[PDB]
Amino acid sequence: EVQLQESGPSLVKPSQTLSLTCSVTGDSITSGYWNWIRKFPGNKLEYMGYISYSGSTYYNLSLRSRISITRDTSKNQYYLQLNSVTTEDTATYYCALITTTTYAMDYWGQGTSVTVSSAKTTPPSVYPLAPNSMVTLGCLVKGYFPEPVTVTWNSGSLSSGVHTFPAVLQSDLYTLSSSVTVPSSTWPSETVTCNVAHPASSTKVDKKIVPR
Amino acid sequence: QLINTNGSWHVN
Amino acid sequence: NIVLTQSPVSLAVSLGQRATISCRASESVDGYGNSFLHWFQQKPGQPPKLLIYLASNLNSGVPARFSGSGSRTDFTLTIDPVEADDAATYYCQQNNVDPWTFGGGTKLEIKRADAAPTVSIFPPSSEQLTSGGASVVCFLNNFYPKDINVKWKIDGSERQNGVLNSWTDQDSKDSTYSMSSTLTLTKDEYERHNSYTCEATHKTSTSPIVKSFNR
Numbered sequence A: 001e002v003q004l005q006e007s008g009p010s011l012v013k014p015s016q017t018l019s020l021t022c023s024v025t026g027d028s029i030t031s032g033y034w035n036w037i038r039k040f041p042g043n044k045l046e047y048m049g050y051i052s053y054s055g056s057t058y059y060n061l062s063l064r065s066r067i068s069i070t071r072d073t074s075k076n077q078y079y080l081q082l083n084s085v086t087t088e089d090t091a092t093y094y095c096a097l098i099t100t101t102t103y104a105m106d107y108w109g110q111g112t113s114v115t116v117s118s119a120k121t122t123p124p125s126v127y128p129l130a131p132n133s134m135v136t137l138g139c140l141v142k143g144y145f146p147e148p149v150t151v152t153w154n155s156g157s158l159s160s161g162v163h164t165f166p167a168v169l170q171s172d173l174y175t176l177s178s179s180v181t182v183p184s185s186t187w188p189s190e191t192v193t194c195n196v197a198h199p200a201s202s203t204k205v206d207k208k209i210v211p212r
Numbered sequence B: 001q002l003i004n005t006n007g008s009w010h011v012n
Numbered sequence C: 001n002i003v004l005t006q007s008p009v010s011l012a013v014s015l016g017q018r019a020t021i022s023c024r025a026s027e028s029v030d031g032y033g034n035s036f037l038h039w040f041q042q043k044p045g046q047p048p049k050l051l052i053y054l055a056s057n058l059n060s061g062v063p064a065r066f067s068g069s070g071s072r073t074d075f076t077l078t079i080d081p082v083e084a085d086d087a088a089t090y091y092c093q094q095n096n097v098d099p100w101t102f103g104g105g106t107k108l109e110i111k112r113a114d115a116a117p118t119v120s121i122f123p124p125s126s127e128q129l130t131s132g133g134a135s136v137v138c139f140l141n142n143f144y145p146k147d148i149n150v151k152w153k154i155d156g157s158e159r160q161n162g163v164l165n166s167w168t169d170q171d172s173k174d175s176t177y178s179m180s181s182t183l184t185l186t187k188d189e190y191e192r193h194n195s196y197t198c199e200a201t202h203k204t205s206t207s208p209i210v211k212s213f214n215r
Helices: C126-130
Strands: A003-007 A018-025 A033-039 A045-052 A057-059 A067-072 A077-082 A091-098 A105-108 A112-116 A125-129 A134-144 A150-153 A162-164 A168-170 A173-183 A193-198 A203-208 B003-005 B008-010 C004-007 C010-014 C019-025 C037-042 C049-053 C066-071 C074-079 C088-094 C106-111 C118-122 C133-143 C149-154 C157-159 C163-167 C177-186 C195-201 C209-214
Touching: A003 A091, A003 A105, A018 A033, A018 A091, A018 A112, A033 A067, A045 A067, A045 A077, A045 C088, A057 A067, A077 A091, A105 C049, A125 A193, A125 A203, A125 C126, A134 A193, A134 C118, A134 C133, A150 A173, A168 C163, A173 C133, A173 C163, A173 C177, C004 C088, C010 C019, C019 C037, C019 C088, C019 C106, C037 C066, C049 C066, C074 C088, C118 C195, C118 C209, C126 C133, C133 C149, C133 C195, C149 C163, C149 C177, C177 C195
Parallel strands: C010 C106
Antiparallel strands: A003 A018, A018 A077, A033 A045, A033 A091, A045 A057, A067 A077, A091 A105, A091 A112, A125 A134, A134 A173, A150 A193, A162 A173, A168 A173, A193 A203, B003 B008, C004 C019, C019 C074, C037 C049, C037 C088, C066 C074, C088 C106, C118 C133, C133 C177, C149 C157, C149 C195, C163 C177, C195 C209
């Protein structure tokens, strides 16, 4: 019933400190082991460390010199700080709990992307893709930095029939696209809108797909 | 339960 | 430092069949009569999910199609019968020897019947042209097997430069794959030509699968 959620900046400059918070709900951080793990773009997972229920810590030796994990039991949060980052520290960061029921990392946050780069935060351009009984439409989201951008269609009410494709980086700018497939009897008679969020630039963009 | 210290689990 | 070696690097299994994945540790991960070796499933855009803890115990919410065995240094995860939702990467993890580590992952692909791609092609939006760029997009959706190649042509001649492609991982419901291909030109170059074509090669056809439009 415990829930964990990571938060903090999505972009950190080389040499500065990366900081994330894990907010824990439905149990108290004064029992269990409260960990950070990260997953590199190449997909490898690396264990970073814990702070335990007592305040004691354990850090991966690969990081021990640059990392600190602390907590605030009055907020039920715990924190990661990773000093002197380089582009090699770009990863998805997760907090997870180990209980002594399983001695395993048994509850996880959804994870949060942190990119380490000197490249500048750049908001997205959102371009509509418009062209049988089925019709496929789409949105092309170009020119933004850093990841993530998320996409929904009709605010999540078109959900099946959607493919949102992993972003591709070229020259410090990402491109991502998303397609949605609906019955031709529903478009253009009823509206279809892709909702693009880029939290790093504090931007949401809705683009309705109108026929050409 | 076991307690972890420096990566290994032990009784005390 | 301790390492966990997973094998095979990947495998493709039909629905209803058995998948066996191995994890070998370079030294014992046992203590107190426990093997501190756990297995996770992970899919894109999601955190790892714990399947098996202390080598052989199913976590709550995991079905008995999953099982693990082993001790000391040699461990196995078995999924039997495999289901479409099992398309993911599986990792072992040990938490009793400093430093704690994960294995390198084993990706499980689910076999299914061949499925031709649904291909749709899209011209540059007027919005993009106002910025002086022009992207032509083709979506190539819900196909199987995963192998596909896209070539672009402009006025009947192949164009290699300006192409950016993206591929989904395998779908957990229908076991298909999808792909997006974008050709980006300047608006000036875009306006020098008439016909734009994405051509896909896929096992389901012995000839290119073609979509086109004319500026």
